[PDB]
Amino acid sequence: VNSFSGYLKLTDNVYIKNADIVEEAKKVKPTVVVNAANVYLKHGGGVAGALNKATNNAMQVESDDYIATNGPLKVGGSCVLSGHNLAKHCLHVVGPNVNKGEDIQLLKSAYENFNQHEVLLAPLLSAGIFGADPIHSLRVCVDTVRTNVYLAVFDKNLYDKLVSSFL
Ligand SMILES: O=C1CC[C@@H](c2cccs2)N1Nc1ncnc2[nH]cc(I)c12
């Protein structure tokens, strides 16, 4: 039993909810919140901009030190950093950004990072300003993640379409 509330169960291990991931993280304080990161960990907009804002820019400060030491992530890759006031840990995962021409096949590799964590609160990777089809992203998530994932979908209209169209 865990503290997530109000989720629709899609499969044995995948759950979904219309919610703001920032507000969901602040309420649940999960072990892992997933960020929709880019390879430079520049958290300017979308989910990343919102999560970083909620940490009062501490996420960005930590991230800049990480990049200075380690260099950029790979598309499809991830790193574990602090969750600050939102979670114990933040798993920064880089899905392909279609608006940059990145290969959508890398979306499966991105979701594979979730399997290193027993339970996660997460957005749909590569959705929103990353330009991929959120219905497809949900399909890849369900077919790739085997650990327990709680998906937060900010847009109510999108959430209803994802549920209604889910096979
Ligand atoms: O609703 C969706 C569907 C795809 C995804 C993205 C689209 C472009 C970049 S990410 N998204 N965003 C969010 N999901 C949950 N909480 C959130 N808080 C702030 C935001 I913005 C946000």
Curated annotation (Swiss-Prot):
Location in the cell: Host endoplasmic reticulum membrane
Activation/inhibition comment: Inhibited in vitro by GRL-0617.
Macro domain boundaries: 1-167
Annotated membrane topology: Multi-pass membrane protein
Catalytic reaction equation(s): Thiol-dependent hydrolysis of ester, thioester, amide, peptide and isopeptide bonds formed by the C-terminal Gly of ubiquitin (a 76-residue protein attached to proteins as an intracellular targeting signal)
Role played: Responsible for the cleavages located at the N-terminus of the replicase polyprotein. Participates together with nsp4 in the assembly of virally-induced cytoplasmic double-membrane vesicles necessary for viral replication. Antagonizes innate immune induction of type I interferon by blocking the phosphorylation, dimerization and subsequent nuclear translocation of host IRF3. Also prevents host NF-kappa-B signaling. In addition, PL-PRO possesses a deubiquitinating/deISGylating activity and processes both 'Lys-48'- and 'Lys-63'-linked polyubiquitin chains from cellular substrates.
Protein name (Swiss-Prot/TrEMBL): Papain-like protease nsp3
Organism lineage: Viruses, Riboviria, Orthornavirae, Pisuviricota, Pisoniviricetes
Gene this protein is translated from: rep
Entire protein: shown range: 1025 to 1191 of 7096
